[PDB]
Structure formats: C-alpha cells, structure tokens
Design an enzyme around this catalytic site. Structure first.
Site, PDB file in Angstrom:
ATOM      1  N   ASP A  31       0.806  -1.253   0.000  1.00  0.00           N
ATOM      2  CA  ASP A  31       0.000   0.000   0.000  1.00  0.00           C
ATOM      3  C   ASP A  31       0.826   1.284   0.000  1.00  0.00           C
ATOM      4  O   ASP A  31       0.799   2.098   0.944  1.00  0.00           O
ATOM      5  CB  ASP A  31      -1.093  -0.007   1.092  1.00  0.00           C
ATOM      6  CG  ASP A  31      -2.222   0.999   0.795  1.00  0.00           C
ATOM      7  OD1 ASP A  31      -2.316   1.493  -0.359  1.00  0.00           O
ATOM      8  OD2 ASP A  31      -3.000   1.321   1.710  1.00  0.00           O
ATOM      9  N   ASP A  72       0.024   2.407   7.017  1.00  0.00           N
ATOM     10  CA  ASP A  72      -0.327   1.021   7.264  1.00  0.00           C
ATOM     11  C   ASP A  72      -0.114   0.100   6.086  1.00  0.00           C
ATOM     12  O   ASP A  72      -0.369   0.470   4.943  1.00  0.00           O
ATOM     13  CB  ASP A  72      -1.815   0.943   7.645  1.00  0.00           C
ATOM     14  CG  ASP A  72      -2.075   1.236   9.131  1.00  0.00           C
ATOM     15  OD1 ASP A  72      -1.131   1.129   9.985  1.00  0.00           O
ATOM     16  OD2 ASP A  72      -3.269   1.516   9.438  1.00  0.00           O
ATOM     17  N   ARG A 130      -2.150   8.793  -0.655  1.00  0.00           N
ATOM     18  CA  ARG A 130      -3.249   8.701   0.323  1.00  0.00           C
ATOM     19  C   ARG A 130      -2.888   7.922   1.582  1.00  0.00           C
ATOM     20  O   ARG A 130      -3.525   8.137   2.626  1.00  0.00           O
ATOM     21  CB  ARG A 130      -4.546   8.119  -0.293  1.00  0.00           C
ATOM     22  CG  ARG A 130      -4.474   6.614  -0.681  1.00  0.00           C
ATOM     23  CD  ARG A 130      -5.833   5.958  -1.065  1.00  0.00           C
ATOM     24  NE  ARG A 130      -6.757   6.008   0.064  1.00  0.00           N
ATOM     25  CZ  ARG A 130      -6.617   5.306   1.194  1.00  0.00           C
ATOM     26  NH1 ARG A 130      -5.586   4.459   1.361  1.00  0.00           N
ATOM     27  NH2 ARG A 130      -7.509   5.465   2.169  1.00  0.00           N
ATOM     28  N   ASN A 131      -1.863   7.068   1.486  1.00  0.00           N
ATOM     29  CA  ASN A 131      -1.364   6.229   2.594  1.00  0.00           C
ATOM     30  C   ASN A 131       0.024   6.670   3.092  1.00  0.00           C
ATOM     31  O   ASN A 131       0.775   5.910   3.674  1.00  0.00           O
ATOM     32  CB  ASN A 131      -1.352   4.730   2.193  1.00  0.00           C
ATOM     33  CG  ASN A 131      -1.247   3.800   3.391  1.00  0.00           C
ATOM     34  OD1 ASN A 131      -1.967   3.966   4.361  1.00  0.00           O
ATOM     35  ND2 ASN A 131      -0.331   2.827   3.336  1.00  0.00           N
TER      36      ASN A 131
END
Length: 262
Positions: free
Chosen positions: A130, A148, A134-135
């Site tokens: 991921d 995460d 956005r992460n």
C-alpha cells in the site's frame, strides 16, 4: 502505557479490525499527544485477534523515521493500539494544497524518504502492498511517513491503478511488486497528488499496460526520475530495480537537484 493515560474523544472511523478512535495520550512527563486508537471487535475470531496483534507488533518494531509511529499497545482485553496522529494529514492532499509553493527538490526528498523505508522492508523481505500518497502522512514539511500495510495480507487465500501486472493477474505480491507500486507513488508525488490512470476504469488498466503503455512523465519531473519510473514498470519483476539501488539513484538525483536550486 496505562489505559487511563489515553482518553477517546470521538470516532475516527472503522478499519479492517474495529472501531478506530481519535484520542489524547498523556505522557509520563505530562505532555498531551493526539492519537489514533485502533481496537478489535471483542465479538471476533481467534484468528483476527492474532492478526490485529501481529500488525501491532510489526508497527511497534519497525521504528523507522519514515514509517508511521506506534506509540503503544494496551494488551488487556479491550485491546487498544495507540498510533501517532499527524495533523498535516495525507501527502496527496498536502501536495494539492501546496502545489503553488513546492519545489521539485522537496518532491524528490519525499520520494527518497519513502524509498528508504521501503529498502528497510525489503531487507527483511516484508511486502507492504500500500504505497500511495493517500497512505503516506506528513509529519512535517521535512518528513513524510509511510502508513499502514495493505490489509490483503490479513485476508486468507483493490488499488488496481497502483498494482503490478502479476499482482492484478496472479495475486502475486513481492518486494518487486512493491517496487512497481513505489514508482506509481513517485509518479503521484511528482504530479502533486494526481491519481494514476485517472482517465481509465479499473478494468481498463491491465489492457493498457499489456500494450506497453505507461503513466506519462509528470510536467515537473526530472527526466532521470521518469526513466527510473519506467524501469520499475517492467513487466518482468526480475528486471525491476531493487529498493537499495533506488535509494542510491534517488540520493544522486537529490544531490543534483539540490545544487541546481542553490
């Protein structure tokens, strides 16, 4: 950390396991720190409890300046994972808000910071799955932190626009597929938070890639960085750069750009 040192203030949302809240942690020194508190449904399987704690143990122990920080773990049986909260928020929104004042040097630096965190994960053969703006969370204008792990690691045997061919086609997830995805995230960073393949539907994506098509050079992207992205997007995972080599190229580009700007 004692349960009474953390006060929950409101619901933040529901994550994969529970039940995530916004809270305040009070230090032994007396400092009030804002935190996210992840919880696990008391009404859930053996196995999910296992996995929820396995995630907590990884985040606790990574302790990397460019991975989001775990502050503590309350094990007893309404279990709280206490994560550091970053009021600058997500990188993609941060880049959007700040497009008019950010310099390329800063975007290279962010790309380099995430690359280092990834090289660390690569060293222990640990697949993140991921790697996206956005992460990633902005600790400071000087520091970004990878968020995460992709929750698909907890599902027993999808961000399609970020994924390698072998991930999409064959559910394959290796450090090499993370390299593909890392380069998409660099594309996003060099594009100020633009979404990859924003003109396509998820089902279109694999077709475009098989034809050899790729995301275009962002306008402010150093050419060296784009050919680096294009190497990450090789259909053959074994032809893709390792994160260690990426860290060396990116540092080289960082030092080059740094001189250019001063």
């Amino acid at each position: 950390i004692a349960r009474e040192d953390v006060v929950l203030n409101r619901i933040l949302g529901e994550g994969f396991f529970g039940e995530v809240y916004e809270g305040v942690y009070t230090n032994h020194k007396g400092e009030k720190i804002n935190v996210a508190v992840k919880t696990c449904k008391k009404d859930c399987t053996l196995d999910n409890k296992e996995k929820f704690m396995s995630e907590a143990v990884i985040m606790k122990n990574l302790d990397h300046p460019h991975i989001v920080k775990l502050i503590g773990i309350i094990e007893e049986e309404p279990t709280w994972i206490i994560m550091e909260l970053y009021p600058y928020g997500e990188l993609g929104h941060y880049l959007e808000r700040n497009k008019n004042s950010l310099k390329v040097l800063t975007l290279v630096l962010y790309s380099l910071q995430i690359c280092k965190a990834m090289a660390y994960l690569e060293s222990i053969n640990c697949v993140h799955r991921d790697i996206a703006v956005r992460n990633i969370l902005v600790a400071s204008p000087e520091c970004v932190k990878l968020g995460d792990f992709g929750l698909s690691r907890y599902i027993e045997d999808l961000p399609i626009k970020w994924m390698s061919p072998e991930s999409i086609n064959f559910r394959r997830f290796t450090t090499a597929s993370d390299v593909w995805m890392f380069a998409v995230c660099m594309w996003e960073i060099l594009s100020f938070g633009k979404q990859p393949f924003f003109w396509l539907e998820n089902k279109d994506v694999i077709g475009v890639l098989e034809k050899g098509d790729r995301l275009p050079k962002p306008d402010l992207c150093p050419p060296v960085l784009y050919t680096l992205m294009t190497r990450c997007w090789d259909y053959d995972p074994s032809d893709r750069p390792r994160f260690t080599e990426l860290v060396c190229s990116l540092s080289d580009v960082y030092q080059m750009e740094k001189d250019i700007a001063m």
